[PDB]
Amino acid sequence: KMKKIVDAVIKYKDSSSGRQLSEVFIQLPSRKELPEYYELIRKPVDFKKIKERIRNHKYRSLNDLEKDVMLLCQNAQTFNLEGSLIYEDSIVLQSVFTSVRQKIE
């Protein structure tokens, strides 16, 4: 299941450096930096967090992961509004994620 998860993630990577719009959700600031985020969202997760975790075999089910991803998108919209770069990025991502997802299914 592991393989599948890795293969699925690796498969979908932008460029060799891994740069893309989601790059905004790769690294999470500090609490201090953004205490609001902490209060607003109980737990901001980023791509590194997932990546790091899975490294140790944290996840085992694709549902779990998917859920996380979907959740992350929402969390961003909760904080962000319409009419912004972030908003745009969240739509694109979702679209792309859906496609992978659909396929994979």
3-state secondary structure of 14: coil
Q: How far apart are CA 10 and CA 36, in angstroms?
A: 32
89 three-class SS: helix
Q: How many angstroms separate the first and last alpha carbons of the chain?
A: 14
Contact indicator for 4, 75 with CB cutoff of 8 Å = no
Geometric angle at alpha carbon 64, from 87 and 89, rounded to 5°: 15
Q: Solved by what technique?
A: NMR
* Domains of the chain from N-terminus onward: 1-105 (1.20.920.10)
